[PDB]
Structure 1
């Protein structure tokens, strides 16, 4: 089941769309969570990859989604993958009704189906060794059926990927409560459609008492949602030794604040959640939540994405240039959505002899 198949299954019947599915070259990086000295085993390697998606309709971009996948290796038989859902955004320049919810769900379903070995086949080394040889890549193997985590932080903003798109009166911005429920629905469906019944499913709303969190969870179809998170309680539950540090994420932003305050050894997980809320509070306060899934896939992931599924630029420079045509554009008028589409289409054609992928919706 290709990305084309997945997207078509949730797009309106007989309607035409195009997509960009862009991916960075997998890179050896530091651990997701800050290591400690008391860990009897630390990761042998952590491999980070970015997937960046844009959907187009009628020659205009209207939706984008940024996802990072981390594969952490302890040895040949011991690995985990984590999908960090970073940013989802719209600009309101789609002239037809689509379910952005289902688009987002289905792209994550596609990512879950990818064999983690796909990211391990050709890994760019971290600078700290390997040395002078320029075209040297690492390769690893792991089992296909590995522990799979998904993490995201819900927090609304006028935009994340489409500058000034809130100036478009057609843009639909969810408030913090609606946005939590929206992502809640998406993850609930991923659990039911893609995860085994023994899976951890966690929700917390920083700064709030669990009673109200528990209230919401009662409407989920996955039967094992709990209030809390998927994080460990290493080192007397110090936040620094248990909180994953993700790109542009509020948790990492607050960890770095504690670092600047010299309090990383003073702040427990419980205080972290209170303070994360506390000290960004009044006029900018909106409902934020942290969601976590940890378990095994129902179907063993064995797909190595084709060129139709993903475009992997030969360099970070090319990757950056293409993504910037989306994120560096101005969307106060529809001309931004048109320009993003034309720039991307021309760049792909001119520099890569590639087309955006065409889709016809199949959903009745």
Structure 2
């Protein structure tokens, strides 16, 4: 954290010179959650705790939202000296209501790099417990006469990035594909768009001994390998970061993320009682063969696993992030973006005006403004 420290610093460095933008950086209160990967009974170490935090970002220009990004950070604790973090990139989207040229690719990369700079201890200082104790008072006692957990871990811990590329008309902006200015990448372009972002993350932010993995489920590895040849990070391989013998059973290896085609298919296997039957190999085949084919669309899975070049030591300021007091408040603010109709620019205007009004009135806070620094 030497040149660029703030989320303001990071966004500004990739946004066009002298142009003005605003951002929403919204964050849930960290909470205890189920392990990312289902534990096996016959394993010698099960996580002490798994802590999950959502970062939701929205970028604005000229009083209109135009981009949003939803990311989940999981800190998995095995002991005091033994921990891992994983950044799951869940949904990125645009609505086409921006009248200036920006690189959404670079905005997306730079956001993840801000996130990579956060000390995992930031999420561990105040954590909502998975099980809360309550004493409930029966109304019978009224007459006519009347806790957060905390943890620590090392700053420099094993860092994972996971994402599933799959194009759609929209993920965060309903009916935005009705906007003729919205630019939708096809599956192949989108896989390349994310592979470019990850390649730069590896080169700018990770040590040279880092695992970098790409698979295209149900497809022969010969296609994957050819593409990887153009990467600048020297250690990309075909496959994933889940591999190895927790047994070959998919359920004890596949991570389970919100709204992810994985989890969705593990859940179908659960309903079919086949969790103790399907190997990782059959998994990737049936994922495509039985579930993902209906989308008629090129999809890929990408994983990174390794150590950051610089020790993450940022605790985001109130400028960097807004953490609502409440889960209801988090949800109401996010829904001003995600519950809007974007078939006209009026949806992009209304999202901005509702968000800024909510923040000002309920939380005495503004959207942050940015002046771009990148020349052409």
CA distance in 1 between counterparts of 2:235 and 2:153 reads: 28
Counterpart of 1:48 in 2: which secondary structure? strand
Counterpart of 1:221 in 2: which secondary structure? coil
Residue 289 (structure 1) shift: 0.2
Contact 2:265 2:291 in 1 (8 A): no
Contact 1:234 1:241 in 2 (8 A): no
Query: Kindly tell me: are residues 298 and 242 of structure 1, through their superposed partners in 2, closer, same or farther at Cα, counting changes over 3 Å?
Result: same
2:35 corresponds in structure 1 to 31
| RMSD over aligned Cα atoms | 1.6
- 1:326-347 Cα offsets, whole Å, 9 max, x none, are 0000000000000000000000
Residue 225 (structure 1) shift: 0.2
CA distance in 1 between counterparts of 2:211 and 2:293 reads: 33
The answer on 1:218 being equivalent to 2:222 is no
Residue 67 (structure 1) shift: 0.1
Counterpart of 2:107 in 1: which secondary structure? helix
Aligned partner of 1:240 among 251, 258, 270: 251
Query: Kindly tell me: are residues 248 and 356 of structure 1, through their superposed partners in 2, closer, same or farther at Cα, counting changes over 3 Å?
Result: same
2:215 corresponds in structure 1 to 204
Residue 235 (structure 1) shift: 4.0
Residue 287 (structure 1) shift: 0.6
Residue 282 (structure 1) shift: 4.9
- 1:130-155 Cα offsets, whole Å, 9 max, x none, are xxxxx911000000000000000000
Query: Kindly tell me: are residues 346 and 196 of structure 1, through their superposed partners in 2, closer, same or farther at Cα, counting changes over 3 Å?
Result: same
Residue 284 (structure 1) shift: 2.5
Q: What is the TM-score when the length of structure 1 is the normalising length?
A: 0.97
Contact 2:162 2:301 in 1 (8 A): yes
Counterpart of 1:188 in 2: which secondary structure? helix
- 1:101-120 Cα offsets, whole Å, 9 max, x none, are 00000000000000000000
Counterpart of 1:235 in 2: which secondary structure? coil
Residue 156 (structure 1) shift: 0.1
CA distance in 2 between counterparts of 1:124 and 1:37 reads: 26
CA distance in 2 between counterparts of 1:91 and 1:232 reads: 37
Contact 2:213 2:238 in 1 (8 A): yes
Task: In structure 1, list runs of 5 or more residues that go unmatched.
Answer: 128-134
CA distance in 2 between counterparts of 1:315 and 1:281 reads: 36
Query: Kindly tell me: are residues 324 and 311 of structure 1, through their superposed partners in 2, closer, same or farther at Cα, counting changes over 3 Å?
Result: same
Aligned partner of 2:88 among 66, 84, 88: 84
Q: What is the TM-score when the length of structure 2 is the normalising length?
A: 0.94
After TM superposition, what 4+ stretches of structure 1 lie above 6 angstroms from structure 2?
none
CA distance in 1 between counterparts of 2:152 and 2:293 reads: 48
CA distance in 2 between counterparts of 1:280 and 1:151 reads: 20
CA distance in 1 between counterparts of 2:321 and 2:36 reads: 24
1:130 corresponds in structure 2 to none
Query: Kindly tell me: are residues 283 and 235 of structure 1, through their superposed partners in 2, closer, same or farther at Cα, counting changes over 3 Å?
Result: closer
Q: Which has the larger radius of gyration?
A: 2
Counterpart of 1:177 in 2: which secondary structure? helix
Query: Kindly tell me: are residues 2 and 281 of structure 1, through their superposed partners in 2, closer, same or farther at Cα, counting changes over 3 Å?
Result: closer
Contact 2:17 2:374 in 1 (8 A): yes
Contact 1:163 1:327 in 2 (8 A): yes
CA distance in 2 between counterparts of 1:50 and 1:325 reads: 17
